[PDB]
mmCIF file of C-alpha atoms and ligand atoms in Angstrom:
data_model
loop_
_atom_site.group_PDB
_atom_site.id
_atom_site.type_symbol
_atom_site.label_atom_id
_atom_site.label_comp_id
_atom_site.label_asym_id
_atom_site.label_seq_id
_atom_site.Cartn_x
_atom_site.Cartn_y
_atom_site.Cartn_z
ATOM 1 C CA UNK A 30 -11.826 -74.633 57.620
ATOM 2 C CA UNK A 31 -9.843 -73.278 60.179
ATOM 3 C CA UNK A 32 -10.926 -70.036 61.770
ATOM 4 C CA UNK A 33 -11.128 -68.527 64.879
ATOM 5 C CA UNK A 34 -14.912 -69.242 65.276
ATOM 6 C CA UNK A 35 -16.295 -71.695 67.680
ATOM 7 C CA UNK A 36 -16.591 -74.745 65.793
ATOM 8 C CA UNK A 37 -12.546 -73.874 63.686
ATOM 9 C CA UNK A 38 -10.884 -71.548 66.122
ATOM 10 C CA UNK A 39 -7.934 -72.461 68.268
ATOM 11 C CA UNK A 40 -9.182 -75.272 70.831
ATOM 12 C CA UNK A 41 -10.087 -76.877 66.769
ATOM 13 C CA UNK A 42 -6.557 -77.035 65.020
ATOM 14 C CA UNK A 43 -5.258 -79.693 66.282
ATOM 15 C CA UNK A 44 -7.239 -82.491 64.443
ATOM 16 C CA UNK A 45 -5.879 -80.912 61.447
ATOM 17 C CA UNK A 46 -2.404 -80.113 62.682
ATOM 18 C CA UNK A 47 -1.386 -82.588 65.241
ATOM 19 C CA UNK A 48 1.646 -80.463 65.166
ATOM 20 C CA UNK A 49 -0.838 -77.586 67.178
ATOM 21 C CA UNK A 50 0.012 -79.634 70.903
ATOM 22 C CA UNK A 51 3.691 -79.880 69.748
ATOM 23 C CA UNK A 52 7.011 -79.275 71.661
ATOM 24 C CA UNK A 53 7.332 -74.902 70.602
ATOM 25 C CA UNK A 54 4.310 -73.679 69.624
ATOM 26 C CA UNK A 55 3.778 -70.364 69.708
ATOM 27 C CA UNK A 56 2.263 -68.044 70.609
ATOM 28 C CA UNK A 57 3.356 -67.947 74.838
ATOM 29 C CA UNK A 58 2.784 -65.921 77.590
ATOM 30 C CA UNK A 59 6.239 -64.038 78.526
ATOM 31 C CA UNK A 60 7.093 -63.755 81.964
ATOM 32 C CA UNK A 61 9.138 -60.661 82.262
ATOM 33 C CA UNK A 62 10.946 -61.831 86.194
ATOM 34 C CA UNK A 63 11.181 -65.459 84.650
ATOM 35 C CA UNK A 64 12.892 -64.194 81.336
ATOM 36 C CA UNK A 65 16.879 -64.343 81.736
ATOM 37 C CA UNK A 66 19.613 -61.773 80.608
ATOM 38 C CA UNK A 67 21.757 -62.954 77.712
ATOM 39 C CA UNK A 68 25.041 -61.371 77.013
ATOM 40 C CA UNK A 69 25.860 -63.470 74.161
ATOM 41 C CA UNK A 70 22.779 -61.519 71.941
ATOM 42 C CA UNK A 71 24.481 -59.605 69.479
ATOM 43 C CA UNK A 72 22.767 -56.067 68.698
ATOM 44 C CA UNK A 73 19.819 -56.576 66.701
ATOM 45 C CA UNK A 74 19.762 -54.732 63.372
ATOM 46 C CA UNK A 75 16.676 -54.208 61.721
ATOM 47 C CA UNK A 76 17.367 -52.885 57.689
ATOM 48 C CA UNK A 77 14.244 -52.457 55.876
ATOM 49 C CA UNK A 78 15.577 -48.605 54.435
ATOM 50 C CA UNK A 79 15.786 -50.500 51.097
ATOM 51 C CA UNK A 80 12.211 -52.519 51.877
ATOM 52 C CA UNK A 81 10.109 -52.500 48.838
ATOM 53 C CA UNK A 82 6.065 -53.032 49.366
ATOM 54 C CA UNK A 83 3.765 -54.415 46.666
ATOM 55 C CA UNK A 84 0.251 -55.248 47.588
ATOM 56 C CA UNK A 85 -1.957 -55.227 50.711
ATOM 57 C CA UNK A 86 -4.100 -58.937 51.210
ATOM 58 C CA UNK A 87 -7.277 -59.912 52.848
ATOM 59 C CA UNK A 88 -6.632 -63.722 53.687
ATOM 60 C CA UNK A 89 -9.638 -64.537 55.327
ATOM 61 C CA UNK A 90 -7.744 -64.695 58.407
ATOM 62 C CA UNK A 91 -6.081 -61.630 58.533
ATOM 63 C CA UNK A 92 -4.721 -58.831 55.980
ATOM 64 C CA UNK A 93 -1.124 -59.170 54.317
ATOM 65 C CA UNK A 94 1.054 -56.218 53.569
ATOM 66 C CA UNK A 95 3.897 -58.108 51.005
ATOM 67 C CA UNK A 96 7.270 -57.147 50.133
ATOM 68 C CA UNK A 97 9.339 -57.861 47.315
ATOM 69 C CA UNK A 98 12.214 -60.560 48.219
ATOM 70 C CA UNK A 99 13.231 -61.525 45.265
ATOM 71 C CA UNK A 100 16.977 -59.606 46.807
ATOM 72 C CA UNK A 101 18.390 -58.284 49.665
ATOM 73 C CA UNK A 102 16.973 -55.365 50.695
ATOM 74 C CA UNK A 103 15.069 -55.330 54.065
ATOM 75 C CA UNK A 104 16.330 -57.491 55.935
ATOM 76 C CA UNK A 105 17.022 -58.493 59.753
ATOM 77 C CA UNK A 106 20.423 -59.461 61.280
ATOM 78 C CA UNK A 107 21.468 -60.114 64.872
ATOM 79 C CA UNK A 108 20.045 -60.735 68.118
ATOM 80 C CA UNK A 109 19.780 -64.616 67.950
ATOM 81 C CA UNK A 110 19.929 -64.808 64.390
ATOM 82 C CA UNK A 111 22.526 -66.725 62.390
ATOM 83 C CA UNK A 112 23.462 -65.377 59.161
ATOM 84 C CA UNK A 113 20.502 -62.772 57.386
ATOM 85 C CA UNK A 114 16.352 -62.905 57.028
ATOM 86 C CA UNK A 115 14.525 -61.229 54.493
ATOM 87 C CA UNK A 116 11.675 -59.737 55.590
ATOM 88 C CA UNK A 117 7.897 -61.079 53.362
ATOM 89 C CA UNK A 118 4.854 -59.554 54.681
ATOM 90 C CA UNK A 119 3.756 -58.277 57.943
ATOM 91 C CA UNK A 120 0.506 -58.461 59.715
ATOM 92 C CA UNK A 121 -1.539 -57.989 62.992
ATOM 93 C CA UNK A 122 -4.009 -60.435 65.209
ATOM 94 C CA UNK A 123 -6.086 -57.762 67.030
ATOM 95 C CA UNK A 124 -9.640 -58.350 69.181
ATOM 96 C CA UNK A 125 -13.082 -57.193 69.171
ATOM 97 C CA UNK A 126 -12.378 -54.526 72.224
ATOM 98 C CA UNK A 127 -8.949 -52.719 73.080
ATOM 99 C CA UNK A 128 -8.420 -54.998 75.967
ATOM 100 C CA UNK A 129 -7.750 -58.082 74.113
ATOM 101 C CA UNK A 130 -5.714 -59.216 70.672
ATOM 102 C CA UNK A 131 -2.405 -59.426 71.242
ATOM 103 C CA UNK A 132 -1.004 -63.272 71.056
ATOM 104 C CA UNK A 133 1.766 -63.215 72.819
ATOM 105 C CA UNK A 134 1.098 -61.505 75.990
ATOM 106 C CA UNK A 135 3.454 -59.985 78.683
ATOM 107 C CA UNK A 136 3.161 -61.381 82.601
ATOM 108 C CA UNK A 137 -0.413 -62.019 81.111
ATOM 109 C CA UNK A 138 -1.419 -59.275 80.108
ATOM 110 C CA UNK A 139 -3.155 -58.519 76.544
ATOM 111 C CA UNK A 140 -2.080 -55.956 73.933
ATOM 112 C CA UNK A 141 -4.899 -54.513 72.055
ATOM 113 C CA UNK A 142 -3.243 -56.351 69.081
ATOM 114 C CA UNK A 143 0.075 -57.705 67.581
ATOM 115 C CA UNK A 144 2.544 -56.501 64.232
ATOM 116 C CA UNK A 145 4.250 -59.284 63.126
ATOM 117 C CA UNK A 146 7.337 -58.848 60.340
ATOM 118 C CA UNK A 147 7.454 -62.149 59.084
ATOM 119 C CA UNK A 148 10.971 -63.080 57.582
ATOM 120 C CA UNK A 149 12.950 -65.981 55.803
ATOM 121 C CA UNK A 150 16.656 -67.258 56.665
ATOM 122 C CA UNK A 151 18.065 -67.110 52.852
ATOM 123 C CA UNK A 152 20.491 -69.798 53.653
ATOM 124 C CA UNK A 153 17.396 -71.629 52.407
ATOM 125 C CA UNK A 154 16.849 -70.037 48.870
ATOM 126 C CA UNK A 155 12.970 -69.767 49.610
ATOM 127 C CA UNK A 156 10.292 -69.292 52.412
ATOM 128 C CA UNK A 157 8.940 -72.394 51.042
ATOM 129 C CA UNK A 158 12.335 -74.132 52.045
ATOM 130 C CA UNK A 159 12.661 -71.965 54.636
ATOM 131 C CA UNK A 160 9.677 -73.334 56.402
ATOM 132 C CA UNK A 161 11.514 -76.558 56.235
ATOM 133 C CA UNK A 162 14.077 -75.954 59.093
ATOM 134 C CA UNK A 163 13.744 -75.348 63.028
ATOM 135 C CA UNK A 164 15.738 -71.718 61.866
ATOM 136 C CA UNK A 165 14.074 -71.085 58.627
ATOM 137 C CA UNK A 166 11.990 -67.939 59.817
ATOM 138 C CA UNK A 167 12.283 -65.031 62.220
ATOM 139 C CA UNK A 168 9.480 -62.861 62.748
ATOM 140 C CA UNK A 169 9.930 -59.421 64.136
ATOM 141 C CA UNK A 170 6.469 -59.180 66.673
ATOM 142 C CA UNK A 171 5.135 -55.638 68.077
ATOM 143 C CA UNK A 172 2.835 -54.487 70.648
ATOM 144 C CA UNK A 173 0.134 -52.709 70.206
ATOM 145 C CA UNK A 174 -1.819 -50.055 72.479
ATOM 146 C CA UNK A 175 -4.756 -47.918 72.169
ATOM 147 C CA UNK A 176 -3.365 -44.302 72.813
ATOM 148 C CA UNK A 177 -1.950 -41.597 70.042
ATOM 149 C CA UNK A 178 -2.306 -42.434 66.451
ATOM 150 C CA UNK A 179 0.450 -43.880 65.107
ATOM 151 C CA UNK A 180 1.310 -41.749 61.638
ATOM 152 C CA UNK A 181 3.137 -44.441 59.984
ATOM 153 C CA UNK A 182 0.010 -46.815 60.572
ATOM 154 C CA UNK A 183 -2.209 -44.232 58.677
ATOM 155 C CA UNK A 184 -1.697 -45.586 55.040
ATOM 156 C CA UNK A 185 -1.985 -48.967 55.834
ATOM 157 C CA UNK A 186 -5.985 -47.958 57.474
ATOM 158 C CA UNK A 187 -7.055 -46.264 54.588
ATOM 159 C CA UNK A 188 -6.129 -49.046 52.513
ATOM 160 C CA UNK A 189 -8.716 -51.175 54.114
ATOM 161 C CA UNK A 190 -11.857 -50.299 52.862
ATOM 162 C CA UNK A 191 -10.563 -51.765 49.042
ATOM 163 C CA UNK A 192 -10.572 -54.764 50.710
ATOM 164 C CA UNK A 193 -13.156 -55.584 53.581
ATOM 165 C CA UNK A 194 -13.694 -58.991 51.987
ATOM 166 C CA UNK A 195 -11.545 -62.202 51.786
ATOM 167 C CA UNK A 196 -9.340 -62.483 48.808
ATOM 168 C CA UNK A 197 -9.409 -59.037 47.751
ATOM 169 C CA UNK A 198 -6.514 -57.469 47.482
ATOM 170 C CA UNK A 199 -4.956 -53.858 46.220
ATOM 171 C CA UNK A 200 -1.129 -52.197 45.072
ATOM 172 C CA UNK A 201 0.180 -51.531 48.118
ATOM 173 C CA UNK A 202 3.723 -49.792 46.351
ATOM 174 C CA UNK A 203 6.417 -47.810 48.311
ATOM 175 C CA UNK A 204 4.909 -48.510 52.200
ATOM 176 C CA UNK A 205 7.372 -47.936 54.761
ATOM 177 C CA UNK A 206 7.848 -50.281 57.588
ATOM 178 C CA UNK A 207 10.113 -48.225 59.387
ATOM 179 C CA UNK A 208 7.631 -46.427 60.481
ATOM 180 C CA UNK A 209 6.024 -48.884 62.940
ATOM 181 C CA UNK A 210 8.918 -49.731 65.182
ATOM 182 C CA UNK A 211 9.214 -48.089 68.501
ATOM 183 C CA UNK A 212 11.757 -46.536 69.803
ATOM 184 C CA UNK A 213 13.520 -48.869 71.072
ATOM 185 C CA UNK A 214 14.743 -52.538 70.487
ATOM 186 C CA UNK A 215 14.904 -54.221 73.244
ATOM 187 C CA UNK A 216 13.217 -57.595 73.422
ATOM 188 C CA UNK A 217 12.482 -61.419 74.573
ATOM 189 C CA UNK A 218 13.344 -64.148 72.374
ATOM 190 C CA UNK A 219 12.034 -67.501 72.097
ATOM 191 C CA UNK A 220 12.343 -70.498 69.720
ATOM 192 C CA UNK A 221 8.762 -71.064 68.312
ATOM 193 C CA UNK A 222 6.084 -71.637 65.640
ATOM 194 C CA UNK A 223 3.710 -69.770 62.756
ATOM 195 C CA UNK A 224 0.429 -68.896 65.196
ATOM 196 C CA UNK A 225 -1.691 -70.067 62.375
ATOM 197 C CA UNK A 226 -2.295 -73.421 60.667
ATOM 198 C CA UNK A 227 -0.062 -75.791 59.586
ATOM 199 C CA UNK A 228 1.526 -74.235 62.957
ATOM 200 C CA UNK A 229 5.188 -75.246 61.904
ATOM 201 C CA UNK A 230 7.755 -75.416 64.449
ATOM 202 C CA UNK A 231 10.722 -72.900 62.080
ATOM 203 C CA UNK A 232 10.136 -69.300 64.499
ATOM 204 C CA UNK A 233 13.238 -67.295 65.718
ATOM 205 C CA UNK A 234 11.018 -65.183 67.650
ATOM 206 C CA UNK A 235 11.355 -61.612 68.328
ATOM 207 C CA UNK A 236 9.007 -59.741 70.361
ATOM 208 C CA UNK A 237 9.716 -55.830 71.556
ATOM 209 C CA UNK A 238 9.082 -55.007 74.881
ATOM 210 C CA UNK A 239 8.124 -51.390 74.052
ATOM 211 C CA UNK A 240 4.443 -51.248 71.963
ATOM 212 C CA UNK A 241 3.583 -48.907 70.074
ATOM 213 C CA UNK A 242 0.202 -46.680 70.447
ATOM 214 C CA UNK A 243 -2.128 -46.570 68.114
ATOM 215 C CA UNK A 244 -5.372 -44.307 67.932
ATOM 216 C CA UNK A 245 -8.872 -46.003 69.052
ATOM 217 C CA UNK A 246 -10.180 -44.783 65.262
ATOM 218 C CA UNK A 247 -7.207 -46.892 63.880
ATOM 219 C CA UNK A 248 -7.831 -49.661 65.516
ATOM 220 C CA UNK A 249 -11.449 -49.595 64.935
ATOM 221 C CA UNK A 250 -11.594 -49.628 61.386
ATOM 222 C CA UNK A 251 -8.880 -52.850 61.607
ATOM 223 C CA UNK A 252 -11.936 -54.289 63.057
ATOM 224 C CA UNK A 253 -13.862 -53.519 60.057
ATOM 225 C CA UNK A 254 -12.739 -56.315 57.714
ATOM 226 C CA UNK A 255 -14.312 -58.959 56.809
ATOM 227 C CA UNK A 256 -12.975 -62.674 57.693
ATOM 228 C CA UNK A 257 -16.476 -63.376 55.063
ATOM 229 C CA UNK A 258 -15.970 -63.141 51.270
ATOM 230 C CA UNK A 259 -17.661 -60.366 48.551
ATOM 231 C CA UNK A 260 -21.495 -60.912 49.407
ATOM 232 C CA UNK A 261 -21.880 -63.211 52.078
ATOM 233 C CA UNK A 262 -23.307 -62.731 55.062
ATOM 234 C CA UNK A 263 -20.752 -60.382 57.470
ATOM 235 C CA UNK A 264 -18.765 -62.004 59.750
ATOM 236 C CA UNK A 265 -16.602 -58.995 61.188
ATOM 237 C CA UNK A 266 -12.612 -60.005 61.127
ATOM 238 C CA UNK A 267 -11.387 -59.393 65.151
ATOM 239 C CA UNK A 268 -10.261 -61.921 67.279
ATOM 240 C CA UNK A 269 -8.324 -62.949 65.274
ATOM 241 C CA UNK A 270 -5.622 -64.239 68.182
ATOM 242 C CA UNK A 271 -4.620 -67.661 69.528
ATOM 243 C CA UNK A 272 -3.881 -67.718 72.891
ATOM 244 C CA UNK A 273 -0.950 -68.642 74.735
ATOM 245 C CA UNK A 274 0.430 -71.947 74.542
ATOM 246 C CA UNK A 275 2.538 -74.250 76.587
ATOM 247 C CA UNK A 276 6.239 -73.006 77.247
ATOM 248 C CA UNK A 277 6.853 -76.303 77.510
ATOM 249 C CA UNK A 278 10.813 -77.121 77.636
ATOM 250 C CA UNK A 279 12.036 -73.334 76.316
ATOM 251 C CA UNK A 280 13.123 -70.385 77.878
ATOM 252 C CA UNK A 281 13.021 -66.932 77.002
ATOM 253 C CA UNK A 282 16.019 -64.517 76.517
ATOM 254 C CA UNK A 283 15.433 -60.983 77.158
ATOM 255 C CA UNK A 284 18.595 -58.305 75.315
ATOM 256 C CA UNK A 285 17.932 -56.541 78.079
ATOM 257 C CA UNK A 286 18.869 -56.074 82.293
HETATM 258 ZN ZN1 LIG B 220 0.760 -63.056 63.149
#
C-alpha cells in the first residue's frame, strides 16, 4: 500500500486517492509576507490539563500517542475555530537528516520535524463522522528544530524501543502534551487536509510560528524506528513527510501582526 518510498510515495498517492490533487490539500508552504493578520481571529485556547494518554502505536507510517477522547478533557478552542475540538492523538513527521522532515514549510524553509496534535469537532459526535465534514478536524502543528533537548519529549523517546516495528503498541499513560508546546501561541491558519491517505479535506490547520527545540539524540531515536513489521528487512522510519502542495484558492491568515 501507500508509503513514502519511490514506488509508493506522495507522488503515487493520487492513483488510489484522487483527492490528492484536490483544492485544499496539505501541507503547504507558508509565505510569511503574503500571510495576513486577521483581527476576526479569537484568542487560541489550548486546554490540555485534563489530557489522558492511553498508549503509543507504531502504525507503519509514524507513531501515534493516543488519548481517551470519550469525554471533554483535552480540547482546542478559539482562534479560527467555532466550537470545541477534542484531542484524539498526536504524532510527528521527520527526516533522515536535520535539514528536512517537516511537512509545512515557512518561506520554503524545512524544519527537522513537525508535531501534529489531532482534534475532532465535538459537534459531530466522533472522529469518523467528523471526517465527513469540511470543518470536522483541527490539527495543531508545531515545528521541531535541532538544538537543546525538550524535557517534555523524553518520555516519548524512551518508549520508542518498545514499538520499533509496524503494529507494535505499548501502554503510555499519564503523558502530558503541554510539555511539547512552545512559549508563544502565535500561529498561521488555513483550511486544508490530512497529509496522509485518505487525504480528507476536513482540516482547519493551525501552525505555530515558534518551533520547539529538541536534541540531536532525541530525533536520532525517532530515526531508529521501522516502517516494516517485526521479522522483516529493516526499513528505517525516516522522511515520512509529504511535500508542500498547491495553495490554490486559499489565503493563509496570521494571528499576529
Ligand atoms: Zn501528521
